[PDB]
Enzyme design. Structure first.
Site, PDB file in Angstrom:
ATOM      1  N   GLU A 142      -3.199  13.504   0.351  1.00 49.91           N
ATOM      2  CA  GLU A 142      -4.475  13.110   0.954  1.00 49.91           C
ATOM      3  C   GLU A 142      -5.231  14.339   1.440  1.00 49.91           C
ATOM      4  OE1 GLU A 142      -3.598   9.625   3.513  1.00 49.91           O
ATOM      5  OE2 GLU A 142      -4.388   8.612   1.731  1.00 49.91           O
ATOM      6  N   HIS A 168       2.197   8.958   0.630  1.00 56.49           N
ATOM      7  CA  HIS A 168       1.142   8.780  -0.374  1.00 56.49           C
ATOM      8  C   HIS A 168       1.528   9.649  -1.547  1.00 56.49           C
ATOM      9  CE1 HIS A 168      -1.476   6.966   2.740  1.00 56.49           C
ATOM     10  NE2 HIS A 168      -0.834   7.813   3.522  1.00 56.49           N
ATOM     11  N   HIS A 185       3.518  11.017   6.110  1.00 56.41           N
ATOM     12  CA  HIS A 185       2.876  10.806   7.409  1.00 56.41           C
ATOM     13  C   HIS A 185       3.854  10.186   8.372  1.00 56.41           C
ATOM     14  CE1 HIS A 185      -1.278  10.649   5.358  1.00 56.41           C
ATOM     15  NE2 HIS A 185      -0.857  11.884   5.577  1.00 56.41           N
ATOM     16  N   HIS A 231       0.812  -1.265   0.000  1.00 54.06           N
ATOM     17  CA  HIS A 231       0.000   0.000   0.000  1.00 54.06           C
ATOM     18  C   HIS A 231       0.822   1.281   0.000  1.00 54.06           C
ATOM     19  CE1 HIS A 231      -3.155  -2.797   1.034  1.00 54.06           C
ATOM     20  NE2 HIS A 231      -2.514  -3.117   2.143  1.00 54.06           N
ATOM     21  N   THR A 237      -6.215   7.064   7.452  1.00 54.02           N
ATOM     22  CA  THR A 237      -6.680   7.211   6.067  1.00 54.02           C
ATOM     23  C   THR A 237      -6.629   5.906   5.275  1.00 54.02           C
ATOM     24  OG1 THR A 237      -4.612   7.753   5.043  1.00 54.02           O
ATOM     25  CG2 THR A 237      -5.852   9.586   6.021  1.00 54.02           C
ATOM     26  N   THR A 238      -6.190   4.820   5.916  1.00 56.75           N
ATOM     27  CA  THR A 238      -6.283   3.472   5.353  1.00 56.75           C
ATOM     28  C   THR A 238      -7.113   2.639   6.297  1.00 56.75           C
ATOM     29  OG1 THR A 238      -4.320   2.571   6.520  1.00 56.75           O
ATOM     30  CG2 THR A 238      -3.951   3.621   4.394  1.00 56.75           C
ATOM     31  N   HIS A 278       5.580   6.942   6.335  1.00 58.59           N
ATOM     32  CA  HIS A 278       5.299   6.455   5.008  1.00 58.59           C
ATOM     33  C   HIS A 278       4.783   7.634   4.180  1.00 58.59           C
ATOM     34  CE1 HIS A 278       1.468   6.358   7.134  1.00 58.59           C
ATOM     35  NE2 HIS A 278       0.984   6.738   5.962  1.00 58.59           N
TER      36      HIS A 278
HETATM   37  N1  LIG Z   1      -2.261   6.980   6.347  1.00 59.30           N
HETATM   38  S1  LIG Z   1      -2.271   6.598   7.925  1.00 59.30           S
HETATM   39  O1  LIG Z   1      -3.648   6.892   8.553  1.00 59.30           O
HETATM   40  O2  LIG Z   1      -1.052   7.212   8.612  1.00 59.30           O
HETATM   41  C1  LIG Z   1      -2.055   4.806   7.915  1.00 59.30           C
HETATM   42  C2  LIG Z   1      -1.764   4.264   9.297  1.00 59.30           C
HETATM   43  C3  LIG Z   1      -1.940   2.747   9.349  1.00 59.30           C
HETATM   44  C4  LIG Z   1      -1.297   2.118  10.592  1.00 59.30           C
HETATM   45  B1  LIG Z   1      -2.221   1.235  11.575  1.00 59.30           B
HETATM   46  B2  LIG Z   1      -1.523  -0.074  12.238  1.00 59.30           B
HETATM   47  B3  LIG Z   1       0.116  -0.113  11.539  1.00 59.30           B
HETATM   48  C5  LIG Z   1       0.132   1.312  10.423  1.00 59.30           C
HETATM   49  B4  LIG Z   1       0.905   1.423  12.019  1.00 59.30           B
HETATM   50  B5  LIG Z   1      -0.180   0.574  13.170  1.00 59.30           B
HETATM   51  B6  LIG Z   1      -1.714   1.399  13.222  1.00 59.30           B
HETATM   52  B7  LIG Z   1      -0.222   2.381  13.104  1.00 59.30           B
HETATM   53  B8  LIG Z   1      -1.617   2.794  12.115  1.00 59.30           B
HETATM   54  B9  LIG Z   1       0.020   2.815  11.425  1.00 59.30           B
HETATM   55 ZN   LIG Z   2      -0.726   7.775   5.603  1.00 59.10          ZN
END
Ligand SMILES: [N]S(=O)(=O)[C][C][C][C+]123[B@]45[B@@]67[B@@]89[C@@]1%10B81%11B698B746B814B562B%10%1143
Ligand SMILES: [Zn+2]
Length: 257
Positions: A103, A93, A116, A61, A195-196, A91
């Site tokens: 985003e 986007h 991010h 992703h 956002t995922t 990471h």
């Molecule tokens: N675009 S965003 O919202 O920053 C994606 C975060 C997804 C995550 B979710 B699980 B793995 C990855 B680590 B841990 B929590 B923390 B949070 B981070």
């Molecule tokens: Zn992100």
């Protein structure tokens, strides 16, 4: 199963993650004229001097650089936050072309990419507990525009060929995330979500006003990544951004006038 394509992208996510239609989803458009300057907001404290990077990973992703979060080594404090938030990973986007990829948007402007830096609140002890709380995470968002190279990004760029496909990782020690920051720590803040998937409504967003500049060669290397695993049909990792979601009953606050 989820991704960014026609059949598994953002418009599908709600079927497995119904909070996708919730009251505090991210990202959002930041309307600069509506955001209110809040003189009660503190300067952001970014303390990354003792950061310990571990690995760089293609998770199908994005790519992530992961940090040791077992001590207060790289922490975010102040700003809109109460208490201390530990850096776990960063990471990006990005888009297929320079006119999309971010985003968050600013007066509907899309940047070429968005960084991010994900942090979790130490009062919940681990990130898995923190995502279950409305104040569990703080994500520092930084826009990327295309111009001059960002020297602090080059170490990342130069290893991306080793993590081309989903499931690949590499050692990535001694990386200093201070090299990814802009000059100013002026920010907007609002309550939102990941956002995922799982789209958990656990994030205090802190979005810096000042973008960083990266070169076209640097962003081109992001776009050579693949969403697919080795052996599967090749699909360039591009346009891995969720569009702006409804602001609903929220206020975006500015730290600056
Ligand atoms: N675009 S965003 O919202 O920053 C994606 C975060 C997804 C995550 B979710 B699980 B793995 C990855 B680590 B841990 B929590 B923390 B949070 B981070
Ligand atoms: Zn992100």
């Amino acid at each position: 199963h989820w991704g960014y394509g026609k059949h598994n992208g953002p418009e599908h996510w709600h079927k497995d993650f119904p909070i996708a239609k919730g009251e505090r989803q991210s990202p959002v458009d930041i309307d600069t004229h509506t955001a209110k300057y809040d003189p009660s907001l503190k300067p952001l404290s970014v303390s990354y001097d003792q950061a310990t990077s571990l690995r760089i990973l293609n998770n199908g992703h994005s790519f992530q650089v992961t940090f040791d979060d077992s001590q207060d080594k790289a922490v975010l404090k102040g700003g809109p936050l109460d208490g201390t938030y530990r850096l776990l990973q960063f990471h990006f986007h990005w888009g297929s072309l320079d006119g999309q990829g971010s985003e968050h948007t600013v007066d509907k402007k899309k940047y070429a990419a968005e960084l991010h830096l994900v942090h979790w609140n130490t009062k919940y002890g681990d990130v898995g507990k923190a995502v279950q709380q409305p104040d569990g995470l703080a994500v520092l968002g930084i826009f990327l525009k295309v111009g001059s190279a960002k020297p602090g990004l080059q170490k990342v760029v130069d290893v991306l060929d080793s993590i081309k496909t989903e499931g690949k990782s590499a050692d990535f020690t001694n990386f200093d995330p201070r090299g990814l920051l802009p000059e100013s720590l002026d920010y907007w803040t609002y309550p939102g979500s990941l956002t995922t998937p799982p789209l958990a409504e656990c994030v205090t967003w802190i979005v810096l006003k000042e973008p960083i500049s990266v070169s076209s060669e640097q962003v081109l290397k992001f776009r050579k990544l693949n969403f697919n695993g080795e052996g599967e049909p090749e699909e360039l990792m591009v346009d891995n951004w969720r569009p702006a979601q409804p602001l609903k009953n929220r206020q975006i606050k500015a730290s600056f006038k």
